[PDB]
């Protein structure tokens, strides 16, 4: 019927007809010189209708995402361990998405990257890290229906001193969302994002900074069970003049930093994902064979973390996991950090480049 105070009712049950709510629908940006894109909404309808089941799956996943993040915003507080934050968020996500093997579930581990760490941090077992009042935490989580992934992220703070940094990144992300469209050059989206983000100056503990985009972090095209499908959306000038195409799905995201505006691999790895371009590899090594079978059954090509392997009842798998990485079957995705003492922020939405309109499905 209606959603409970702490959410527990799956999205599927809240919509008995199986028709999930649409995200924000936008007309495409004008075709430079200056031709209108409004014609698409009236043609394109046949091509849009053909993929209705696909858009409907993204919508169910997007509704689960909205209700989980509204729940997260109501209780996330300093003093909580990073493990409890991730477990509370994931328990709600599993329930609302109605987790069912590879058919419905979590598209990737909950990122909760702190301060100079911009992405790919999730605690492993035994991590005693506690969220602090002065922390800047990037909550980045994903849901999927039949591998139709919603990649959506926001930044959590408790100290108002970071307000302008968050506004800079939010404005840069909304710019990217507005600039995106069929036949738009990916380098143009990048330059517009940078121009907006770099117009902001911030003061944190008596020090001033110009907000800079993290040049080696970017938005990207999304494929079925494939978080990155091949096209990169830069967030600085100097990128590639490759164009966005009809029917594509993008994660439009920006990262702002008071640091160097560049990230490097740091800390213990938590995130792993099977390489999409590797076919069948016969393995005789028993622990390695077992772990690969666990990955193929539970995750396929979706990203996973060590906590999820622990949750499945696996143990003493670290060497088997390293073997899969050395064989090129699995790739590690360690935390990406800017310089010590720097602050990073992120905002992200998933968009559908439908033949009729641009739908910000996660908004
Ligand atoms: C850098 C990062 C990648 O994906 C990292 C993925 C997998 C692990 C976590 N992860 C996440 C988590 C949250 N949000 C995300 N948005 C995009 N990816 N992403 C690559 C994928 C494919 N080829 C090149 C790549 C280079
Ligand atoms: Mn993300
Ligand atoms: Mn992303």
């Amino acid at each position: 019927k209606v959603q409970t105070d702490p959410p527990s009712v799956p999205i599927c049950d809240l919509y008995p007809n199986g028709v999930f709510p649409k995200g924000q629908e936008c007309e495409y940006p004008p075709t430079q010189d200056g031709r209108t894109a409004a014609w698409r909404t009236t043609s394109k309808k046949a091509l849009d209708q053909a993929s209705e089941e696909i858009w409907n799956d993204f919508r169910e996943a997007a509704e689960a995402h909205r209700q989980v993040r509204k729940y997260v915003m109501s209780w996330i507080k300093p003093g909580m361990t990073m493990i409890e934050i991730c477990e509370k968020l994931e328990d709600c996500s599993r329930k609302l998405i109605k987790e069912n093997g590879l058919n419905a579930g979590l598209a990737f581990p909950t990122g909760c990257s702190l301060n100079n760490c911009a992405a790919h941090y999730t605690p492993n077992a035994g991590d005693t890290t506690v969220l602090q009042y002065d922390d800047i935490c990037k909550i980045d989580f994903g849901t999927h229906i039949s591998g139709r992934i919603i990649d959506c992220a926001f930044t959590v703070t408790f100290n108002p001193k970071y307000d302008t940094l968050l506004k800079a990144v939010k404005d840069a992300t909304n710019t990217g969302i507005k600039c995106a469209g069929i036949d738009v050059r990916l380098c143009d989206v990048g330059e517009a994002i940078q121009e907006v983000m770099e117009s902001y100056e911030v003061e944190i503990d008596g020090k001033t900074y110009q907000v800079k985009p993290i040049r080696n972090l970017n938005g990207h095209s999304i494929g079925q069970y494939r978080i990155h499908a091949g096209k990169t959306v830069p967030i600085v000038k100097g990128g590639e003049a490759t164009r966005m195409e009809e029917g594509e799905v993008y994660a439009i995201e920006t990262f702002g930093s008071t640091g160097k505006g560049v990230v490097h691999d740091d800390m213990e790895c938590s995130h792993y994902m099977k390489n999409f371009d590797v076919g069948h590899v016969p393995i005789r090594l028993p622990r390695t064979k077992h772990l690969l079978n666990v990955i193929n059954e539970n995750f396929g090509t979706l990203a996973f973390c060590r906590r999820w392997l622990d949750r499945l009842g696996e143990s003493k798998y670290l060497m088997a996991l390293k073997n899969l990485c050395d064989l090129g079957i699995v790739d590690p995705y360690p935390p990406l950090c800017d310089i010590k003492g720097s602050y990073t922020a992120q905002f992200e939405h998933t968009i559908l480049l439908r033949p009729t309109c641009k739908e910000v499905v996660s908004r």
Side-chain angles (χ1 to χ4, degrees):
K1 36 195 90 181
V2 76
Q3 188 59 275
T4 53
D5 192 277
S8 63
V9 189
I11 306 308
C12 191
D13 296 353
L14 297 177
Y15 296 89
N17 56 334
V19 176
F20 302 98
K22 296 175 168 184
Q24 173 197 27
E25 289 172 319
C26 310
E27 264 183 8
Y28 282 106
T31 314
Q32 50 189 277
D33 26 41
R35 302 272 76 90
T36 200
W39 62 273
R40 289 184 183 268
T41 207
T42 232
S43 306
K44 302 295 172 187
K45 267 168 92 279
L47 254 32
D48 192 45
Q49 197 63 64
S51 293
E52 192 62 53
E53 288 161 45
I54 300 159
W55 320 136
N56 194 59
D57 288 349
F58 276 110
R59 284 163 196 152
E60 181 177 10
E63 189 54 29
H65 203 288
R66 282 187 286 274
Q67 294 191 27
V68 172
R69 69 194 192 250
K70 182 143 108 172
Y71 172 54
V72 174
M73 289 303 292
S74 84
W75 52 255
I76 193 163
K77 285 301 190 307
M80 293 181 75
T81 66
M82 303 316 291
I83 292 183
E84 69 185 291
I85 293 168
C86 290
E87 289 185 346
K88 201 173 187 190
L89 192 153
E90 289 162 9
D91 276 338
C92 184
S93 194
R94 296 187 201 272
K95 282 171 181 163
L96 303 198
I97 205 64
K98 205 176 195 284
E99 188 182 48
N100 186 30
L102 293 176
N103 297 112
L106 315 190
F108 53 82
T110 305
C112 55
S113 312
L114 304 161
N115 303 320
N116 63 306
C117 179
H120 299 167
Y121 167 72
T122 199
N124 285 330
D127 193 335
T128 58
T129 305
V130 165
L131 181 66
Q132 306 297 314
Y133 176 85
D134 287 330
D135 283 347
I136 175 155
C137 180
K138 282 72 70 187
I139 293 294
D140 186 349
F141 72 100
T143 56
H144 82 88
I145 297 293
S146 310
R148 308 306 179 174
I149 299 163
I150 296 293
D151 188 4
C152 182
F154 58 97
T155 303
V156 173
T157 61
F158 306 101
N159 194 327
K161 73 187 184 182
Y162 307 118
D163 285 357
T164 306
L165 173 61
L166 263 59
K167 200 200 175 293
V169 180
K170 206 185 282 96
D171 190 10
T173 297
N174 289 329
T175 300
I177 291 165
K178 289 169 209 169
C179 285
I182 301 166
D183 309 324
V184 173
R185 280 126 52 86
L186 295 165
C187 62
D188 294 347
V189 184
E191 188 182 71
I193 280 164
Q194 189 180 24
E195 277 194 63
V196 163
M197 222 196 278
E198 284 178 359
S199 77
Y200 286 83
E201 56 181 16
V202 304
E203 192 190 354
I204 306 159
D205 308 306
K207 204 192 170 293
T208 72
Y209 313 88
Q210 181 176 62
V211 184
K212 48 219 278 185
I214 300 177
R215 66 196 180 199
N216 61 333
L217 282 180
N218 9 55
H220 49 96
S221 66
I222 291 167
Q224 201 185 10
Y225 297 100
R226 208 180 175 177
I227 188 65
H228 200 310
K231 285 200 191 156
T232 78
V233 187
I235 64 168
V236 300
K237 69 184 85 188
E240 291 191 312
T242 303
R243 279 163 155 92
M244 291 185 162
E245 302 181 70
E246 187 185 87
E248 288 181 334
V249 178
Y250 282 88
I252 304 296
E253 65 184 318
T254 79
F255 293 86
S257 178
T258 63
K260 251 195 98 80
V262 65
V263 290
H264 66 274
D265 292 355
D266 211 349
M267 308 195 284
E268 180 167 288
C269 193
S270 59
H271 290 54
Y272 303 83
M273 189 173 75
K274 205 246 261 271
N275 181 289
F276 203 90
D277 300 314
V278 176
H280 175 72
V281 179
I283 303 178
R284 278 198 205 262
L285 297 161
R287 290 167 268 182
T288 306
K289 185 191 186 60
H290 177 72
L291 185 56
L292 181 54
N293 285 335
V294 170
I295 293 160
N296 285 342
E297 288 171 25
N298 295 274
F299 316 119
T301 56
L302 301 167
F304 61 96
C305 66
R306 293 197 211 176
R307 279 186 297 107
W308 290 358
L309 293 174
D310 300 337
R311 192 169 178 275
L312 291 168
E314 295 295 319
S315 62
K316 311 171 287 290
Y317 57 77
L318 294 176
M319 190 66 67
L321 187 55
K322 183 193 179 283
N323 286 348
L324 297 170
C325 291
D326 296 340
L327 285 163
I329 296 160
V330 170
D331 294 310
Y333 287 91
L336 301 168
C337 308
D338 202 323
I339 264 74
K340 192 246 184 74
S342 74
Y343 303 102
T344 67
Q346 176 203 21
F347 290 94
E348 175 174 37
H349 273 303
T350 294
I351 70 156
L352 314 167
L353 302 180
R354 289 165 55 201
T356 52
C357 70
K358 166 177 62 187
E359 183 182 349
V360 191
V361 70
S362 55
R363 176 120 70 196

